[PDB]
Amino acid sequence: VTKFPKFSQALAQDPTTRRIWYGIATAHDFESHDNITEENLYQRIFASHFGHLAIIFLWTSGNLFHVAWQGNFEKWILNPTKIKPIAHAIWDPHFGQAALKAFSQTGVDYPTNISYSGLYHWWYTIGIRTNNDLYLGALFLLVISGLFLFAGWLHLQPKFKPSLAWFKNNESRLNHHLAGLFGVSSLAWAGHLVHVAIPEARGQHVGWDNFLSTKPHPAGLEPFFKGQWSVYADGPDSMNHVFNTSEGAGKAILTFLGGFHPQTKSLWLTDIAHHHLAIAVIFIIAGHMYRTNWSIGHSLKEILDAHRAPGGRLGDGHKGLFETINNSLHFQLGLALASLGVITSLVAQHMYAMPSYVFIANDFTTQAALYTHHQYIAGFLMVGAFAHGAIFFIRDYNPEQNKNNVLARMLEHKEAIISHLSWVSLFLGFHTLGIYVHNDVVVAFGSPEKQILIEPVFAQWIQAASGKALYGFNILLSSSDSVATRAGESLWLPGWLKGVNDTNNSLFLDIGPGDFLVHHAIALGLHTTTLILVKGALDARGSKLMPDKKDFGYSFPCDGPGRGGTCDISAWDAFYLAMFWMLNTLGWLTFYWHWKHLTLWGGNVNQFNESSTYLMGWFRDYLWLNSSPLINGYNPYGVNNLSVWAWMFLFGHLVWATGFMFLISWRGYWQELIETLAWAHERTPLANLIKWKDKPVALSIVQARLVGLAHFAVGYILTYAPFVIASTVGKF
Amino acid sequence: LGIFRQAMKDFASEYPDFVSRGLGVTSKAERWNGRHAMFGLLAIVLTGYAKGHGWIPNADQVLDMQQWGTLVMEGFNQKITNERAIVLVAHIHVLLVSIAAAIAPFSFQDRLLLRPGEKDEEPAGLLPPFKLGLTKEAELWNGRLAMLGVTFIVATSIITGQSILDVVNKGLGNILY
Amino acid sequence: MTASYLPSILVPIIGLVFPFISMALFFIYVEQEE
C-alpha cells in the first residue's frame, strides 16, 4: 500500500489520485487520524501553535528587514504626507524597460512597490527613527521566532510533554492570560510609550543606550509614591506641537484630552499611554478571579452549575456546560473565532474613525486598504466560528450530559429559531430591494422627487447623544444643560466635541437616506448569513429528510437521489453556502465604506448623497466611474505604475470565473471524460510506454465544491483589492 | 570517536532515506565535498592571479541590457560587470560536467550516491592512516584540509572585513597580486 | 561581493530551484510504497 498519508490507512489504500488530494486536505484534522489519543491530540496541537507563532514573528521580521534595507523610511519621516513609503524592491527579469521606469518613480533609483500596510505610520508613531532601529527590530524577532520553534520541539520530547490535566487547568490559564498576557503586556506597552514614543515625539532621542539615565518626567517617580499623580498630567503638548520636534511640546506623560492632535490628525500619545495603564490595572485585577493553588477565588464549574433562573424559564440553566466545553476543542475554537471576529470588526470600525498613527488619516489608500483587510478577515472568522459550532454538535455534543440545559433547549426550539431568521431575512430583503427599485424606476423616468428617502434619525440621535450638534436634537452631550455634559466638561469633552463636530475627519460622518438603505442591506446580509450558518449547526445532527445525519459526519457529498434528492444536505454544505453570503455582505459594506470616503476625500459628499439612493448610482458613479485609472494601468500607448493592479484585476476576474466551472458542472460529467483520456493514453504509441502509478479520477463531489469556493473567494479578493487600491491612488 | 559515532547514528535515525543514499553526515559526502573544496581553492587562486595579471578583458566594464537582456540587472539598478559574468561562465562549464558525471557516470569512476544496498565507507576518525601517494587516505587528508581552508578564509573575510582574494593573497605573501 | 547582488542570486533560487526540489521530494514521498 502507498504509505502517504501515514495517518490514514483508509486513504493510503486508495489506488487513485484521490489519495493524494484527501491526504493533503485532512492533514490538520488530528482528531480523525488513526489511533489518536486525547493526550497526543493536545500535545500535537500545542506544538503546532508554537510553529504558528514562529511564522508570525518571521513575517514581522521580514517586513522590518525589507523596509530597513530597501525602503525610504528615513526620507519618508521628513515629509510623510508627500513621499510614498516603499514596501520592497522589485527584481523581475520579465520586466521590459518601460515597466522598470514606471515602477522607479518613488525617489529612489531602482523599481519598488509602494506600501499600503501603514507600517511606516505605525513605526514612526511608536518612536522608530532610523534604519538601524528597524534592523535591530528585525534581528530581535528572528531570535523570538527561533525560540518558539525550539519550544515547539522541546514540548514534544518525552520528559517535557505536558499532561492532559495541565491542558485542562482552566482557572490557572485564565488567571495568567488575563493578568499576564493581557494585563502586563498592556502595562509594558504603556512603559514603551512613556519612556520612548512620547519623548521621541517631542524630539528627544531615547534608546537602549540612554534610557536608564533619561527620566520620562522631570519629577521622576516621587509624585507616584506620594500619590500626587496629577503632576503627570500637567503641561500637555500644545495645539501647535510639531510632531517629532520640541516646538510646542509638553511635559505631561498621562492625560485625558480627547480627540486629535491637530497636526498629525491622530489620537494624543499621552491619552494612549494612559489608556493602556488603566486597562492594565483592570486586567491584572480581573486575573485574580479564579481559584488556583491558594483556596481563594472561583471555580468555573461552580459558577456555571449555579446559574439557573429560579422561575425555570432557562430550564436547568448552565448545568453540564462546564464538562461539555472542557471536553470540546471545537466549542472552544468556535468561542475564540466568534470573539475574535467581533473584535477584528471593532478594530476596523474604530481605526478609521479614531486613528492612532501619525498622518495615516492623510494616506487615503492605506486607510482604505486597512479597513477592507480587517473586515474581510472578520468575515472569515465569523464563518469559521459557526463552522466549528456545527462540528461541535456532531463530534462532541452528548445529549444525555446536557439534558434540559440552555444548550439542549436551543435544539428543542430549533424550528422556531430557523423560521424566525427566515422571516426577518425575507422581510428585510423584500422591502430593502423594493425601495431601491422604487427609487431606480422613479429616477429613471426623470422624477427623483418621487423617491422614498428615509432619514436615519435613530443613528443621528445616537450621534447627537455623543455631542454632534448638526441635527439640533439637543440631547445629552449635544445639550449644554445636561448632567452628562456637565460631568465631563473639565476632562475629555472639549477635545472630543471638537473632533466630533469637525466635518473634515471620519469621526461620526454625516449620514442621510443613502446610509439608511445600505445599513438595511447590511442587516439583510448579517441575518441571511446567520440563517444559513445557524440552520447548518442546529440541523447538523439530523432533519426530517435525514434523521440520522450525525452518523455521516460533518462533511459528506449527499445521501443520494432518493427521498426527492439530497444534494448539499451536510452541515459542511451550510458553511459552503454561507461563504457566498459572507462575501456578498462584505462586498456591500466595503463598497459603502469606500464610496462614502472617496466622496468625502474628494470634497463631493453630494455625489454620494444623491447617487446612493438608487442602484444605478452605485453602478455608474462608484463602479464605472472609478474603474478608469485602473483599466488604463496599461494600454496601447504605454504603462504606468497601476499596470500591476490592472493585470491583477483581470487575474481576479479569471480566477473567479474559473470557480464557476467547479460550482456549476458536477462530478459525473468529468469522470466520463477522464475515462476517454485514460483510453487514449494506453492506445497511443510511444506515450503508452509511460504509465501512471495513481489511477486518474475526477475530483470528489465535496472536493469540487471546495475547489470552486476557493477560486470564487480568491478571485473575489484579487479583483477588489486592486480596484480599491488603484481607484484611490488614481484619484488622489 | 564515541561522540562522532553517536552523532552519525542520530542523523541516520532522523533521515534514513537520505543517509542510505550517502547524503548528509556520511563518508560519501565528506569525500565529495573534499574534492570540490580542493578544486575550489585552486579556482580562487587562479581568479586572484587572472585578475592581477589582467587576463580577463574589460573586467570592470558593465554589460548592456540591449545585448544580454534583463538578467544583467542587479538589485539596486546596478548592472553585472564583464568580470563577474565571465567567472560565472567558467563555473557553468564544470557544473555541466558535474550533471553529466552525476547522472551518466563513467563505469570506473566513483558515483555520487550509494547503490541500492551499498554500505558507507567506514569513518576515517580523528586522524586517517597516513599513506603517501594517490590513495583514498591522502585524498581524505587533503579534502578535509581544503574544506577547513575554505571555512577559515570565508570566516576571516567577514570578521576582519577584508576580501577573500585579499586574505588569500596576503596568506600566500602577495604573490597573486 | 555586495548586497545589491543578492536579488539576482536569490530570486532565481527561491523561484526556479527551491520549488522544483520541493515538488520532486513531495512526489517521491507520496509514491513510496514502504
Binding site: 508554537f50 510553529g51 538601524n132 528572528l142 520553534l149 520541539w153 | - | -
Partner: peptide, 28 residues
C-alpha cells in the same frame, strides 16, 4: 545606510529558525 555586514549577520541568524523549523517539522 545598512551595510553588507549587517545583511550577512541577518542571513546567518536566519539559519537558526531554519534549522529549528526543520527539527520541529520532523518531530511533528
Amino acid at each position: 545606510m545598512i551595510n553588507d555586514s549587517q545583511i550577512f549577520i541577518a542571513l546567518i541568524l536566519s539559519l537558526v529558525p531554519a534549522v529549528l523549523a526543520l527539527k520541529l517539522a520532523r518531530e511533528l
